[PDB]
Amino acid sequence: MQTVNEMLRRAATRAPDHCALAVPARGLRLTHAELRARVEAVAARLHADGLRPQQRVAVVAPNSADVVIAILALHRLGAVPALLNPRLKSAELAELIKRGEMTAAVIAVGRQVADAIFQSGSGARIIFLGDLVRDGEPYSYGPPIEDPQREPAQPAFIFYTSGTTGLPKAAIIPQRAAESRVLFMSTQVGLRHGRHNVVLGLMPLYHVVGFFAVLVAALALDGTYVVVEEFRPVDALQLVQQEQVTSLFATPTHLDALAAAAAHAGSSLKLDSLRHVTFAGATMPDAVLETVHQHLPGEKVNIYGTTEAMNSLYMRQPKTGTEMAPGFFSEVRIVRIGGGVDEIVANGEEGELIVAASDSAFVGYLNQPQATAEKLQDGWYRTSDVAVWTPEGTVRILGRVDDMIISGGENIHPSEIERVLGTAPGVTEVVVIGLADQRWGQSVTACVVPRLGETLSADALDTFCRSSELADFKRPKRYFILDQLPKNALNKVLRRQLVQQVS
């Protein structure tokens, strides 16, 4: 195999004096050799402090040059980074770190989260990111350290994704998965090796796209990763021009915002260096696809994928957002919903898209054998995406098998929000749905029934969500206060019908 460490090590031997990390706002630039030196220094320090290979270490930080260094240093040592969304609140972060039996937690989020981890009794050593590396500069002691033995099936990285109930699942990415999780960017997207590559780091590092397909791929191809700490679409387009960005890979949400900024820049706008605009994370709305086609340059590529199996379908110069086909690495099937992996659907019958679990695939969810058995069956990964084969022989993605909402490319299950809002004073029933939204894809929407003879307020419900343990980004954008909810003859709420009722 070629591990992340190996890809980046080899890249640094080929292009030592070429810029690896650019942070234009902070005036920081690091060559491949400089980055390597810093990764080594941070690895040596962690090792001197006692950290061992195969130990799990949480990483909870927004995108920055410092977190890039920390993640790669953990991997260099042989520790398994468990990347966590820094927008999550203290109790959720502490409980995930506890259940993960992690050895340390590198955080940039800082004091209340740190206390939560301590009080949880996990025993994870809390490390402030700024105490490890600051503005690219490590605090190091200790000799150079050995290379850990990495084995193909062995845990390498952990990424989290939402289940239909409970806390997010910890997807274990094996060492062997790294190469294909990078190289689809060559085979599908058409990136090629070279120092010409200038990649805009829009996507979060704590998800597989922002990590493997953006950061690792940029450096592994001997190019430059441009760090973006906060998404501002006007500033982003200015970076494209300023850094001469050649490729950008983002959500339909990002691209709706970018294409709008592009249009608003007027008839003089030129973004000549940009050769690739790639999208993933959610269904690309047709309206967004039109603005992207009309206002941004480069080849447009739709990339369908999952945390668990990475890229499974794609489309170059798509005419619609729903239609894609398997590329290199990939084998796919559409099977009867609820049926076995061999129960392939007829002609144009709808079913669940399932994808072969090969090199790119996760090896299970940490400490969740039941959740794993539901998703990994007879060599296949079950996407929970509804799909159909077209007369053209392509795959049309139609929606979810489950009730998962996808907003800003983030999976949010309605139960997360229903659990919280169900305890808000005055609420007698709550059902949460996703409404079609050009910007967000699906907009989190609460349908709430007040106690008889009482009223409810969208402002008060929103306040309650914000003070709750629920991540702020997940809270409802809109509330519908209703006297009743549509129900079947078994008193279950007709969720899909309700979507049509309030849309």
Ligand X SMILES: CC(C)(COP(=O)(O)OP(=O)(O)OC[C@H]1O[C@@H](n2cnc3c(N)ncnc32)[C@H](O)[C@@H]1OP(=O)(O)O)[C@@H](O)C(=O)NCCC(=O)NCCSCC(=O)c1ccc(Cl)cc1
Interacting residue ranges for Mg ion, rule: CB under 5 A: 230
- Measured from the CB atom, the residue of 64 and 407 that comes closer to ligand X is 407
Q: Is 281 in the site for ligand X (CB under 6 A)?
A: yes
Q: For residue 148, give the H/E element and its range.
A: none
Residue 278 interacting with ligand X (CB under 6 A): no
Task: Tell me the three-class secondary structure of 342-361, residue by residue.
Answer: CCECCCCCCEEEEEECCCCC
Q: Structure tokens of 425?
A: 């004073």
| CB of residue 437 to Mg ion, shortest distance in Å | 17
How far is 286 from 323, CA to CA, in rounded Å?
11
* Shortest reach from residue 286's CB to a copy of itself, in Å: 23
* Distance, CA of 7 to CA of 190 (rounded, Å): 18
Does position 411 interact with ligand AMP (CB under 6 A)? The reply is yes
225 sits near ligand AMP (criterion: CB under 6 A) = no
Q: Is 10 in the site for a copy of itself (CB under 8 A)?
A: yes
Residue among 44, 65, 116, 280 that touches ligand AMP (CB under 6 A): 280
Distance between CA atoms of residues 431 and 419, nearest Å: 10
Total residues contacting ligand AMP (rule CB under 6 A)? Answer: 18
Selected binder of ligand AMP within 305, 318, 327, 434 (CB under 6 A): 305
Binding mask 361-400 for ligand AMP (x = CB under 6 A): ----------------------xxx-----------x---
Residue 103 or 445: the one with the smaller Cβ distance to ligand X is 445
Tell me which stretch binds ligand AMP (CB under 6 A): 42-50, 183-191, 279-287, 489-497.
279-287
> Which does residue 220 touch among Mg ion, ligand AMP, a copy of itself, none (CB within 5 to 8 A, set by kind)?
a copy of itself
Rounded Cα distance between 420 and 88, Å, is: 15
Alpha-carbon distance of 83 to 75, in angstroms, equals 12
Nearest approach, Cβ of residue 288 and ligand AMP (Å): 12
Site for a copy of itself in 187-216 (CB under 8 A): 187-190, 192-194
Say how far apart CA 83 and CA 74 lie, in whole Å: 11
Of 184, 211, 304, 464, the one binding ligand AMP by CB under 6 A: 304
The distance of closest approach from Cβ of residue 362 to a copy of itself in the complex, given in angstroms and rounded to an integer, is 17
Stretch that binds a copy of itself, among 32-40, 178-186, 337-345, 412-420 (CB under 8 A): 178-186
3-state secondary structure of 283: coil
Residue 253 interacts with ligand AMP (CB under 6 A)? no
Reduced to 3 states (helix: H, G, I; strand: E, B; else coil), residue 388 is strand
List the one residue from 157, 440, 464, 480 that touches ligand X (CB under 6 A). 440
- The single-letter code of the amino acid at 64 is S
Query: CB 327 → a copy of itself: shortest distance, Å?
Result: 5
Is residue 180 within 8 Å of residue 359, measured between CB atoms?
Answer: yes
Q: Got the DSSP string for 49-105?
A: TT--TT-EEEEE--S-HHHHHHHHHHHHHT-EEEEE-TTS-HHHHHHHHHHTT-SEE
DSSP H or E run through 410: strand 410-412
**196 backbone dihedrals φ, ψ, rounded to 5°:** -65, -25
Task: Choose among 424, 406, 422: nearest CA to 474.
Answer: 406
Give exposure, 296-324, as e/b (b: 16+ Cβ within 10 Å): bbbebbbbbbbbbbbbbbbbeebeebbbb
Helix 252-264 / helix 233-243 crossing angle, nearest 10 deg: 80
CB of 204 to ligand AMP, least distance (A): 11
Q: Is 352 in the site for ligand AMP (CB under 6 A)?
A: no
> 230 or 392: whose CB is closer to Mg ion?
230
Size of the site for ligand X (CB under 6 A): 26
For ligand X, which stretch binds (CB under 6 A), given 203-211, 234-242, 260-268, 383-391? 203-211
Strands (DSSP E) found in 121-260:
125-128, 133-134, 137-138, 155-161, 169-174, 198-201, 224-227, 247-250
Structure tokens at 48: 């001197």
Count of residues in contact with a copy of itself, rule CB under 8 A: 33
Amino acid identity, position 372: T
Positions in 328-347 near a copy of itself (CB under 8 A):
328-332
Q: From the list a copy of itself, ligand X, ligand AMP, none, pick the one residue 252 interacts with, judged by a Cβ distance below 5 to 8 Å according to partner type.
A: none
CB of 86 to Mg ion, least distance (A): 12
Binding site for a copy of itself (CB under 8 A): 1-2, 6, 10, 13-14, 152, 176, 180, 183, 186-190, 192-194, 220-222, 316, 325-332, 356, 358-359
Q: Using CB under 6 A, list all residues that contact ligand AMP.
A: 161, 280-283, 302-308, 383-385, 397, 406, 411
